[PDB]
Amino acid sequence: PGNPLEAVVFEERDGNAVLNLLFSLRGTKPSSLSRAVKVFETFEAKIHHLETRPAQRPLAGSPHLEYFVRFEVPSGDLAALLSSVRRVSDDVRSA
Amino acid sequence: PGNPLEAVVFEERDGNAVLNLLFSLRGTKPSSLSRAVKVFETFEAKIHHLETRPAQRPLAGSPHLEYFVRFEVPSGDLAALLSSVRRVSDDVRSA
């Protein structure tokens, strides 16, 4: 489906797009967040703040797995590597 | 070579090891930091704070590429996945 009023959005700066993206995964093996960094790095984008820190550990019984990231990619290549990020996540949103 | 007084060290907590590791890479393609997250995740370790943010961008002409991370792994499996991390980096140190 395609939600227009969804949270996943972005902006452009100096001719590129600066945005953030979060994504979580259950289990203990499915943690291919690594492939996610391969995205922003594939189109030589400029990462602002890539971070990963599963929940529970700090507090448990309220939060859940997470992964905060901020990066910038040409307004055109964004959609390019983002597709990959869509290839890694789908049921999440931007930060 | 093997430097004993080197910076790369670690500690153990509750029967596991909690430490930090930094590593940098030049160019634009060699950014396989992703494989690094595959390490701490391979032995189901507990990551405290994994982060990546190349230098220059904030300030240039003093710093350089970097990648700060903090994670914990059984005092035994640490050496296990760290070897992998050694398979990704060698000329760097802990945080």
Swiss-Prot record, chains A, B:
Its annotated compartments are: Cytoplasm, Perinuclear region; Nucleus; Cell projection, Axon; Cytoplasm
Fill in the subunit field for this protein. Homotetramer. Interacts with NT5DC2; the interaction results in reduced phosphorylation and decreased catalytic activity of TH.
Give the signal sequence positions: none
Q: Mind telling me what this protein is named? A: Tyrosine 3-monooxygenase
What this protein is reported to do is described as: Catalyzes the conversion of L-tyrosine to L-dihydroxyphenylalanine (L-Dopa), the rate-limiting step in the biosynthesis of catecholamines, dopamine, noradrenaline, and adrenaline. Uses tetrahydrobiopterin and molecular oxygen to convert tyrosine to L-Dopa. In addition to tyrosine, is able to catalyze the hydroxylation of phenylalanine and tryptophan but with lower specificity. Positively regulates the regression of retinal hyaloid vessels during postnatal development.
Gene of origin?
Th
What the record says about family reads: Belongs to the biopterin-dependent aromatic amino acid hydroxylase family.
Q: Which organism is it from?
A: Rattus norvegicus
Q: Which residues of the full protein are shown?
A: 65 to 159 of 498
